[PDB]
Amino acid sequence: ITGRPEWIWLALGTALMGLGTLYFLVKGMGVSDPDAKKFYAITTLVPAIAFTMYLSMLLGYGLTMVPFGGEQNPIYWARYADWLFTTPLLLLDLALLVDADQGTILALVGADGIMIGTGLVGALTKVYSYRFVWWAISTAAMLYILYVLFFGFTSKAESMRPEVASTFKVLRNVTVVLWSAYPVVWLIGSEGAGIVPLNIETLLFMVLDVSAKVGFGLILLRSRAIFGEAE
Amino acid sequence: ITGRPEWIWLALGTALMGLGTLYFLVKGMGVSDPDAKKFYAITTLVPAIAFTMYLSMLLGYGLTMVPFGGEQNPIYWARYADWLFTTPLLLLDLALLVDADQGTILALVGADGIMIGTGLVGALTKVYSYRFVWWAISTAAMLYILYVLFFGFTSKAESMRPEVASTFKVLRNVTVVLWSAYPVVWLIGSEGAGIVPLNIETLLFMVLDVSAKVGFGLILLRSRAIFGEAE
Amino acid sequence: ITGRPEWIWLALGTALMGLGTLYFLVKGMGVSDPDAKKFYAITTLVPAIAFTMYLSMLLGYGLTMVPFGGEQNPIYWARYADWLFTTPLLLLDLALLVDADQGTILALVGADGIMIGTGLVGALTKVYSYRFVWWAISTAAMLYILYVLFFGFTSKAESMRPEVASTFKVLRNVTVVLWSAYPVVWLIGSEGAGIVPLNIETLLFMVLDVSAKVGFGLILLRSRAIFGEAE
Ligand SMILES: *C/C=C(C)/C=C/C=C(C)/C=C/C1=C(C)CCCC1(C)C
Ligand SMILES: *C/C=C(C)/C=C/C=C(C)/C=C/C1=C(C)CCCC1(C)C
Ligand SMILES: *C/C=C(C)/C=C/C=C(C)/C=C/C1=C(C)CCCC1(C)C
């Protein structure tokens, strides 16, 4: 473990996901409302999956060596196996909040799958210039997702209950700001231009992951918007 | 790129998927009806996924070498990663048209997954005779899908709105004719008996893919059947 | 085939899955009730997927060599590709029986995916001590699933129709007893401590798989609980 200088951030990430999982799991024990049970299930599944993948990176399983630039570069592929499942679930948390129609949910989940899959292909691509072509395609998918979150979801949330509108507005702003940082970190880090070394990149991804999963869930699961309107 | 003689068809396929994606994406911008939004989301996701996989084949990522017959044979595995996601979506486009029940949809999607997965296993199998065992299992799954499209779906479509019945009949005939050609091309091409060389096989798959995705979508998204009956 | 002593059990498993698939496929031909069609679709898909993966193990495709303990150990990875799709479907068969809410279904399917995925990671892990860490995480996911089947599902089934309550109670007891045996067999077999040799382990998994899929389906598809209450 300790032979890699990024291990501490991996270890910290593992701890912060596991604790977060346990907290959400304890917080949803006394919940009988089926809407709230949906939100608790999705929101608790997110850091549990992230916990397993951070642990696989810490133990060395989720790492491979990819030759590009004449070098063997360490690529943590397990992130993508994380994100493939946790980014649609997070989007589902937003979409159930505003009661989105099924076609918009399918468009969001499909564009997210394209984003993560093309990011994985770009991370594993051996021709150095082609990695940025895949980065550009994935960033276009992200920009579609952010467009849908701003111009199909806010004006839908304004016509619903005021608590779900305010909670959605906060979670939307958190999501857009945090998700936009990931392609920048990928571009300047070890998967892209190699300006930022791998230990600092691992720290940055850990802060982003913990914020976008545990902090997101802390804002969501403390709101009254997850419960059905009942007496 | 240009070192492989099939590259031109890969390039053409990439172009025709991307253009098709853009056209559907522009055509669904002015759509507010939620049924039509479902059909536009599914139908636009299909050539976008196909675009990414054609690009991966063009850049050389979606190709591997499989030893059989004493030879290293070029196998484009990315097709299967395409088809695993795009063939159920296309089937979903048919199933939402006739308002199929959930069990029939689950049977169709599961049989389709078996078809694509056993095709992938047969494409990667190193023992030459076993490749045709997997081909036979996949063809049996295809024949189940075609049976369901003819004897559980046509007599359901006849009791619905006449526009959805005529549009379903056209798309069903297009789907059956185009999908039946794929196991023949696999059997006589480089994955099977090797009678047709890889560049002609790549051309044939490109014509089939463009027809079964973009032409299918052009027939579907121009019909009144995708809209709810409203004044 | 015959060079491996476990081949006979693989062959027997393949036969028993295929026959079981055919029987369910013939038994659901005369079914028009949409609830019963859902149960027949799920229950027939389970041994069909298991058939394909048993065949891949018999032909040698679903086997890889994993170095641990200074040895190259034969690991049948195809089991996990089986279980990833067939264990949620079986859970779905239970969840549709008691009309479970969507959040509970999502929690069950997600915990099941974590169980199978961490089992696969543990099966492929080259550091011998870490294999049991992944075993422990997967067993914790299994214990969550069994908790939900006993303390969120039985008291829901008691308020429904009596035939669905009795059928659910039988299938729940069968499921809990059979599913609890799998981590024990993994732990003492060739993936874990290596006390039981691979041919006996393959026999044990074949008996468990045939019981938990075909016997489960025989109990389910003979019950009146799968039909809607109609005159
Ligand atoms: C739980 C972690 C989350 C919320 C991860 C979010 C990740 C992204 C929004 C990733 C985006 C990427 C691009 C847009 C292009 C470069 C490749 C990726 C995968 C880093
Ligand atoms: C978008 C492309 C589509 C519609 C692809 C359709 C592909 C099939 C129907 C493939 C079928 C196969 C068999 C039935 C057996 C041989 C292996 C396959 C995968 C080529
Ligand atoms: C169709 C076959 C079925 C029902 C398989 C069930 C498998 C399990 C419940 C597997 C569980 C495992 C653990 C709980 C820990 C050890 C690893 C596994 C994957 C064997």
Author numbering:
A (entry chain A), B (entry chain A), C (entry chain A): 4 to 234
Q: Which sentences did the original study use to describe this structure?
A:
The best characterized system is bacteriorhodopsin (bR), a light-driven proton pump, due to its biochemical robustness. The retinal chromophore of bR (Halobacterium salinarum) is linked to the side chain of Lys216 via a protonated Schiff base (PSB). Photon absorption by all-trans retinal triggers a functional photocycle consisting of a series of distinct spectroscopic intermediates (I→J→K→L→M→N→O) with sub-ps (I), ps (J), µs (K, L) and ms (M, N, O) lifetimes. Deprotonation of the Schiff base of photoisomerized 13-cis retinal and protonation of Asp85 during the L→M transition ultimately results in proton translocation to the extracellular side of the membrane.
For comparison, we also collected data of the dark state. In the dark state, the polyene chain of all-trans retinal is largely planar (C6-C13) with a slightly pre-twisted C13=C14 double bond when no planarity for the atoms around this bond is enforced during refinement (torsion angle −150°, “dark-unrestrained” structure), in line with computational work (−160°). In the dark state, PSB forms a hydrogen bond with Wat402 (2.8 Å).
